[PDB]
Amino acid sequence: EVQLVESGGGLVQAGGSLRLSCAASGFPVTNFEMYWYRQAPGKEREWVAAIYSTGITEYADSVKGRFTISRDNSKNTVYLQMNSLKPEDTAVYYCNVKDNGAWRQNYDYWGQGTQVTVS
Amino acid sequence: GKKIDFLLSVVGFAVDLANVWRFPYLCYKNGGGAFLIPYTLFLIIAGMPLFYMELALGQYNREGAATVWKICPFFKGVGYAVILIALYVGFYYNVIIAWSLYYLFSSFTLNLPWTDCGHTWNSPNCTDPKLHTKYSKYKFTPAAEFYERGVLHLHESSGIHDIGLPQWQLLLCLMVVVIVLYFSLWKGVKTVVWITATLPYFVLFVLLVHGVTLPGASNGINAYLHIDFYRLKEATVWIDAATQIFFSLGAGFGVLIAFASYNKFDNNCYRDALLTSSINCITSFVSGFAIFSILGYMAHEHKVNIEDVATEGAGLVFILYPEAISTLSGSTFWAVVFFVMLLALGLDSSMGGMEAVITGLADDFQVLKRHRKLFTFGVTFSTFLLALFCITKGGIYVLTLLDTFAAGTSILFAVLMEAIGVSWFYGVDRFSNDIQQMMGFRPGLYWRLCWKFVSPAFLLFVVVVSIINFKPLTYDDYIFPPWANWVGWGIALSSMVLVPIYVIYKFLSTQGSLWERLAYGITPENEHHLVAQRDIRQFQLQHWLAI
Ligand SMILES: NC[C@H](O)c1ccc(O)c(O)c1
Ligand SMILES: [Cl-]
């Protein structure tokens, strides 16, 4: 039932802006923790941003001040507003859902991923 | 194999130590069948509905009892109150587990200590039927004497004013109980079932089938299946039935919310509620039938009347089931089986009640989430230290006070506030939409009507009568002093006042005008952007007309 569909990727010039969308289904994004990961070509999955059930957002140091994670509880969508995109930001950005808190560990669903390429 | 696992899970969830220990003496205290009418009625109209409501609340919000009130911030005092109630109830639940452990340890003999007199704990008045004042409890049976004098050592206590020092055998049993609890809770969340979902039913079936054949069991069955309708015109039976419903089902403790907060979001809470309530009803009817068959057997063995043959207090089963075991062949095997069953049931229920507190408070404070071993130790150690009062010589009096006031009017008021906050302020239509999101079907009209009008109305009725028709606390022929009643009402109010206290605190801490503070307190925390937009549903009539 839990389905995450990322969208909003594509080619973008260096220093541009992209907004990724994660159309969540099968759960309310308001009560769950939503994460953004990116797997650069030839690297491991890097955690990018996290918005928690409380709405508190955390970012990786490589994206602090540039990427913004937000959610639309009415649409059950999570966004990743990526600004000042450096060539290094090219990757497959994955949207991940986790359950609320560290003691709830039975939700780790991922999306197919959206490709972002910065030229 | 999977089917067996599902059956074990559902029947183990349905069965509580309350169903096997607490229901018998509220049933006996209220005549039996007359107790089963208010009990069944309350189950149908408030317990199954509110069991379903708590399961859906926890399963949708992924929160414990306190933090689930992000949907209506003003009502978080309700979650704090249910957590406090669960802590209070753990202060004496683990003592019943300790009694079960003591009885299991005493069961490792071919001469069970409760069968005959002539032990060091027996009074000169011990009357062995194998070789009475009318309106008075017997207390002179070998099983009653074993319980009260060789287990409780109650003869060394004059009253709750003189409770004495903690009995050391019960102290060691309580130590074992709480160490087991800690090491069952310290490394993970509570959420064995081949014992706690099969042994209670096997034991109940054995007791029923054997008791129906006991001499005089027919008289107890006739007393049970006799409705004394004069009892139904008093509030005692109704209050007892409502409290037992919420005690056995687990509502008003944060236990259901915390348990469901760890369920899969799409788990069927409707089917869970139906199964748990149906099994609770059946195992309560059969439990009462079996205990009344035993009681009618003791009334014939001891030549005393059924209404006077046994205690109406917490330790009723610790006399009745030993009395039944004594009549069974291979009574040592059956004593071990029964007290292992009681210990397992109580440990499961206590772990669930402790997880209510741990989850409810670690969801609220995330520092506690990084320290589960230490926070679990704090909870278990506090419970042990405050349960040390119920293992004193007069610990039965403390346990009676607690079993009367920790979750009585307080638990009824807490579930009433939960029902109101969910179905009037958050919105029963919104809650039904949440349940549709989880399960795919929207709750039916019966459930919504019960959530918004029927369960709140009946809960308010029981809460009001519990206060205006309060009866001073007694244990058998012992009348507690008035200050004990004031202390018990203080214990009840300690959780009851957390609701208004939190409402006042939330109002004063919030910034803005009066209407801005009200909107922030009734709007969910994740929709507080609407307050600035003047888009509060609760400020429109259509919200409150919703069904
Ligand atoms: N039946 C009561 C329920 O299982 C329960 C609630 C709170 C507790 O601390 C407990 O031990 C048990
Ligand atoms: Cl029950």
Substitution target in A32, A53, A97, A107 with the highest count of B β-carbons within 10 Å is: A53
Opening angle at CA B345, ends B226 and B159, nearest 5: 70
Report residue B80 CA to chain centroid gap. Answer: 18
CA end-to-end distance (rounded Å), chain A: 36
Instruction: Please give the sequence-ordered ranges of beta strands (E in DSSP) within B168-226, or none if there are none.
Output: none
Element (H, E) at A11: strand A10-12
Q: How far apart are CA A34 and CA A55, in angstroms?
A: 10
Q: How far apart are CA B312 and CA A73, in angstroms?
A: 53
Which contacts qualify for B206-212: CB closer than 8 Å, 24 or more apart?
B206/B328, B206/B334, B207/B290, B207/B294, B207/B321, B207/B324, B208/B286, B208/B289, B208/B290, B208/B293, B210/B324, B210/B327, B210/B328, B211/B290, B211/B293, B211/B294, B211/B297, B211/B324, B212/B293
- A27: chain B residues, CB-CB within 8 Å: 265
Q: Confirm or reject: Cβ of B240 under 6 Å from ligand 1.
A: no
* A1, A99, A101 ranked by CB distance to B369: nearest: A101
Report residue B350 CA to chain centroid gap. Answer: 10
DSSP secondary structure, B357-405, as one string: HHHHHHHH-THHHH-HHHHHHHHHHHHHHHHGGGGBTTHHHHHHHHHHH
DSSP secondary structure, B407-474, as one string: TSHHHHHHHHHHHHIIIIIIIHHHHHHHHHHHHSS---HHHHHIIIIIHHHHHHHHHHHHHHT----E
Q: Confirm or reject: Cβ of B389 under 6 Å from ligand 1.
A: no
- B525: chain A residues, CB-CB within 8 Å: 54
3-class state of residue B510 by DSSP? coil
* Residue B29 labelled as part of a binding site: yes
Measured over the CA atoms of residue B238, residue B241, residue B243 and residue B249, the dihedral's sign is negative
Residues contacting residue B232 through CB under 8 Å, at least 6 positions apart: B34, B37, B38, B238
Q: How far apart are CA B235 and CA B485, in angstroms?
A: 18
- Closest among B172, B1, B41, B22 to B92, alpha carbons compared: B22
Under a CB-based contact definition with an 8 Å cutoff, are residues B50 and B251 in contact?
A: yes
- Closest among A37, A42, A79 to A60, alpha carbons compared: A37
Tokens found for residue B112: 């069970």
CATH of domain B2-191+194-509: 1.20.1740
Residue numbers after which chain A is interrupted (C to N above 2.5 A) read: none
3-class state of residue A12 by DSSP? strand
Under a CB-based contact definition with an 8 Å cutoff, are residues A20 and A37 in contact?
A: no
Query: What's the number of CA atoms in the CB half-sphere (13 Å) around residue A33?
Result: 20
The identity of residue B92, as a single letter, is Y
Domain hosting residue A66, numbered range: 3-118
* Residue B15 labelled as part of a binding site: yes
Task: Output the CA torsion B516→B521→B527→B532 (10° steps).
Answer: 0
Q: How far apart are CA B224 and CA B32, in angstroms?
A: 5
Closest chain A residue to B68 measured between Cα atoms? A31
Tokens found for residue A57: 């957002």
Query: What's the number of CA atoms in the CB half-sphere (13 Å) around residue B447?
Result: 25
Is the Cβ pair A102, B369 closer than 8 Å? yes
Under a CB-based contact definition with an 8 Å cutoff, are residues B421 and B80 in contact?
A: no
Measured over the CA atoms of residue B12, residue B433, residue A54 and residue A6, the dihedral's sign is positive
The Å distance, Cα B63 to ligand 2 centre, comes to 26
- Closest among B96, B61, B68, B35 to B414, alpha carbons compared: B68
Taking the CB of residue B340, how many other CB atoms lie within 10 A of it? 17
Q: How far apart are CA B508 and CA B517, in angstroms?
A: 8
Tokens found for residue B361: 């408070």
Distance from CA of B413 to the nearest CA of A (A): 27
Q: How far apart are CA B70 and CA B502, in angstroms?
A: 13
Alpha-carbon distances of B364 from A59, B66, B76, B125, B359, rounded to whole Å = 23, 7, 10, 55, 8
- A54: chain B residues, CB-CB within 8 Å: 525
Alpha-carbon distances of B370 from A100, A106, B153, B254, rounded to whole Å = 14, 18, 42, 21
Q: How far apart are CA A85 and CA B163, in angstroms?
A: 73
Closest chain B residue to A106 measured between Cα atoms? B264
Q: Where are the alpha helices (DSSP H) in chain A?
A: none
Opening angle at CA B175, ends B324 and B398, nearest 5: 70
List the strands of the sheet with A3-7, edge to edge: A3-7, A18-25, A77-82, A67-72
Q: How far apart are CA B389 and CA B398, in angstroms?
A: 7
Tokens found for residue B212: 């129906």
Which residue CA neighbors atom 12 of ligand 1 most closely? B353
Domain boundaries, given as residue ranges, for chain B: 2-191+194-509, 510-547
Q: How far apart are CA B361 and CA B383, in angstroms?
A: 15
Angle of helix B455-468 versus helix B235-249 axis, rounded to 10: 120
- Closest among B9, B69, B533, B5 to B271, alpha carbons compared: B9
Residues contacting residue B416 through CB under 8 Å, at least 6 positions apart: B456, B459, B460, B463
Tokens found for residue B146: 């074993």
Which DSSP letter does residue A91 get? E
3-class state of residue B227 by DSSP? coil
Which DSSP letter does residue B166 get? B
- Closest among B451, B405, B412 to B428, alpha carbons compared: B451
- Residues counted in chain B: 547
Name the β-bridge partners of A11: A117
Closest chain A residue to B363 measured between Cα atoms? A101
Alpha-carbon distances of B347 from B57, B101, B401, B403, rounded to whole Å = 25, 10, 22, 17
- Closest among B171, B83, B106 to B395, alpha carbons compared: B171
3-class state of residue A80 by DSSP? strand
Q: Confirm or reject: Cβ of B21 under 6 Å from ligand 1.
A: no
**What CATH number does the domain containing A96 carry?**
2.60.40.10
- Closest among B417, B372, B456 to B74, alpha carbons compared: B417
Which contacts qualify for B97-100: CB closer than 8 Å, 24 or more apart?
B97/B17, B97/B177, B97/B342, B97/B343, B97/B346, B97/B347, B97/B350, B98/B170, B98/B173, B98/B174, B98/B176, B98/B177, B98/B387, B98/B391, B99/B151, B99/B170, B99/B173, B99/B315, B99/B318, B100/B339, B100/B342, B100/B343, B100/B346
- Closest among B55, B514, B491, B509 to B256, alpha carbons compared: B55
**Burial label, B58 (beta-carbon count in 10 A; 0-12, 13-18, 19+):** buried
Please name the method used to determine this structure: cryo-EM
Is the Cβ pair A106, B363 closer than 8 Å? no
- Closest among B240, B325, B188 to B34, alpha carbons compared: B240
Which contacts qualify for B151-158: CB closer than 8 Å, 24 or more apart?
B151/B99, B151/B102, B151/B103, B151/B106, B151/B318, B152/B315, B152/B393, B152/B395, B152/B396, B153/B121, B153/B393, B154/B393, B154/B394, B154/B396, B155/B123, B156/B393, B157/B392, B157/B393, B157/B394, B157/B395, B157/B396, B157/B397, B158/B394
* Residue B259 labelled as part of a binding site: no
Tracing tokens 């503070």 back to the chain, one arrives at B517
- B528: chain A residues, CB-CB within 8 Å: none
Domain count along chain A: 1
DSSP secondary structure, B100-163, as one string: HHHHHHHTSSSS-TTS-S-STT--TT---TT---TTS----SHHHHIIIIIIS-GGG--BTTB-
Q: How far apart are CA B441 and CA B271, in angstroms?
A: 12
Tokens found for residue B99: 């009694």
The identity of residue B141, as a single letter, is T
Report residue B38 CA to chain centroid gap. Answer: 17
Q: How far apart are CA B198 and CA B215, in angstroms?
A: 28
Report residue B204 CA to chain centroid gap. Answer: 19
Name the β-bridge partners of A108: A98
Angle of helix B514-522 versus helix B498-509 axis, rounded to 10: 130
Tracing tokens 């003047």 back to the chain, one arrives at B534
Tokens found for residue A61: 């140091």
Tokens found for residue A12: 């973008």
Tokens found for residue B211: 């008791």
Is the Cβ pair B60, A28 closer than 8 Å? yes
| φ/ψ bin of A103: left (φ > 0), alpha (ψ from -120 to 50), beta (otherwise) | alpha
